[PDB]
């Protein structure tokens, strides 16, 4: 029954992933427009909550780690650069694959999950 609420989430998520991608591509690393970063962070926060609500473990954890990083960057605690933005784009790419698996009642890719989470946690570490 709870699956009766997946379709709306899947559509919202796809749209938010597209927005995330465009904002990422338009970001100026050394001087990121505050309003643009806030939008990326909000898309991630939204996707994370939906993932939690429906028990999409892999997507939730992946988005969780990205969100914390986007929070650091938007609060100005973390400096951005082209490498970080490329990591965010790669993260958006992987999240889309995870979502596409759920749409098919399939399980996301375990290896891609471990790789992206490892990279995101490495960056946070480096940020500290």
Short mmCIF file of N, CA, C and O in Angstrom, two decimals, residues 19-29 31-33 36 40 85 89:
data_model
loop_
_atom_site.label_atom_id
_atom_site.label_comp_id
_atom_site.label_asym_id
_atom_site.label_seq_id
_atom_site.Cartn_x
_atom_site.Cartn_y
_atom_site.Cartn_z
N UNK A 19 17.34 19.42 -11.77
CA UNK A 19 17.64 20.76 -11.25
C UNK A 19 19.02 20.79 -10.61
O UNK A 19 19.76 21.76 -10.77
N UNK A 20 19.33 19.74 -9.86
CA UNK A 20 20.60 19.64 -9.17
C UNK A 20 21.74 19.69 -10.16
O UNK A 20 22.72 20.41 -9.97
N UNK A 21 21.60 18.92 -11.24
CA UNK A 21 22.60 18.85 -12.29
C UNK A 21 22.86 20.21 -12.94
O UNK A 21 24.01 20.61 -13.12
N UNK A 22 21.78 20.90 -13.31
CA UNK A 22 21.90 22.21 -13.94
C UNK A 22 22.53 23.23 -13.01
O UNK A 22 23.39 24.00 -13.43
N UNK A 23 22.12 23.25 -11.74
CA UNK A 23 22.70 24.20 -10.80
C UNK A 23 24.18 23.90 -10.61
O UNK A 23 25.01 24.82 -10.56
N UNK A 24 24.52 22.62 -10.52
CA UNK A 24 25.91 22.22 -10.36
C UNK A 24 26.74 22.72 -11.53
O UNK A 24 27.81 23.30 -11.34
N UNK A 25 26.23 22.51 -12.74
CA UNK A 25 26.92 22.92 -13.95
C UNK A 25 27.07 24.44 -14.03
O UNK A 25 28.02 24.93 -14.64
N UNK A 26 26.16 25.19 -13.42
CA UNK A 26 26.25 26.64 -13.48
C UNK A 26 27.03 27.26 -12.34
O UNK A 26 27.31 28.46 -12.36
N UNK A 27 27.38 26.46 -11.34
CA UNK A 27 28.11 26.98 -10.20
C UNK A 27 29.51 27.47 -10.55
O UNK A 27 30.19 26.88 -11.38
N UNK A 28 29.91 28.56 -9.91
CA UNK A 28 31.24 29.15 -10.06
C UNK A 28 31.89 28.77 -8.74
O UNK A 28 31.71 29.44 -7.73
N UNK A 29 32.67 27.67 -8.73
CA UNK A 29 33.34 27.18 -7.52
C UNK A 29 33.94 28.20 -6.54
O UNK A 29 33.66 28.12 -5.34
N UNK A 31 33.26 31.35 -6.28
CA UNK A 31 32.26 32.31 -5.83
C UNK A 31 30.86 31.78 -6.09
O UNK A 31 30.08 32.38 -6.83
N UNK A 32 30.52 30.63 -5.48
CA UNK A 32 29.21 30.01 -5.66
C UNK A 32 28.05 30.89 -5.22
O UNK A 32 28.01 31.36 -4.08
N UNK A 33 27.11 31.13 -6.14
CA UNK A 33 25.94 31.93 -5.84
C UNK A 33 25.20 31.25 -4.70
O UNK A 33 24.79 30.10 -4.82
N UNK A 36 22.05 29.49 -5.46
CA UNK A 36 22.17 28.28 -6.27
C UNK A 36 22.54 27.08 -5.41
O UNK A 36 22.01 25.99 -5.60
N UNK A 40 20.53 23.41 -4.50
CA UNK A 40 21.11 22.08 -4.62
C UNK A 40 20.91 21.34 -3.30
O UNK A 40 20.54 20.16 -3.29
N UNK A 85 32.93 19.81 -7.39
CA UNK A 85 31.75 19.89 -8.22
C UNK A 85 31.62 18.64 -9.10
O UNK A 85 30.52 18.13 -9.33
N UNK A 89 28.53 15.97 -9.24
CA UNK A 89 27.90 15.54 -10.49
C UNK A 89 27.88 14.01 -10.57
O UNK A 89 26.90 13.41 -11.01
#
